[PDB]
């Protein structure tokens, strides 16, 4: 799951108005 992954990396799980696809992409660029 995207949220738990970002959380595990200490990154925000959600930026203001961020949608699912954007959240996924944000994580994808960090990995």
């Amino acid at each position: 799951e995207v949220k738990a992954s970002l959380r595990a990396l200490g990154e925000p799980i959600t930026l203001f108005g961020e949608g699912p696809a954007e959240r996924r992409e944000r994580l994808r660029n960090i990995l």
Partner: protein, 173 residues
């Protein structure tokens, strides 16, 4: 301790156009769930009005009173007259279980009993006289320094910051 973890949100603050850091805030959902949820959603932009996400992103701290408090969250009018909530219009004071016993606490601004909206303030000192009048719903867990930077901003009449104090970005941790 299998207690649900309280929501943690964050505000990235900008002063006079320059980024000055991130403040992370724990919302006491396990004490004032309704008030905490209203705030979390305005941080995540999950609440939409006419298809448009609404919240603290880009809003300001319109009043800074050193040794007392910093107030913002008026994304409606940006001057302290704005009122909005995920419950539509002002909502009731959930409860007064928590006090303004220390700096760094998040509390709901209002204009009398049950007039909570979107505006809030962060305590810069202990505000005993405010207990029972304003609902305390959270506290800074990281970035106390950012709050002090905000607190030191130079102000003019009615303690309005002379430079723009903007929440450049926000969301949930």
């Amino acid at each position: 301790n299998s207690s649900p973890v309280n929501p943690v949100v964050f505000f990235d603050v900008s002063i006079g156009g320059q980024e000055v850091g991130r403040m992370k805030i724990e919302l006491f959902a396990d004490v004032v769930p309704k008030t905490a949820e209203n705030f979390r959603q305005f941080c995540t932009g999950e609440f939409r009005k006419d298809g448009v996400p609404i919240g603290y992103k880009g809003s300001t701290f319109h009043r800074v009173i050193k040794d007392f408090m910093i107030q913002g969250g008026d994304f409606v009018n940006g001057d302290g007259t704005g009122v909005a909530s995920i419950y539509r219009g002002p909502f009731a004071d959930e409860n007064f279980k928590l006090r303004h016993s220390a700096p760094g606490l998040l509390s709901m601004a209002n204009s009398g009993p049950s007039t909570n909206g979107c505006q809030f303030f962060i305590t810069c000192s202990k505000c005993d006289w405010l207990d029972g009048k304003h609902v305390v719903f959270g506290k800074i867990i990281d970035g106390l320094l950012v709050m002090r930077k905000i607190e030191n901003v130079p102000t003019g009449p009615n303690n309005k910051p002379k430079l723009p104090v903007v929440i450049s970005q926000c969301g949930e941790m």
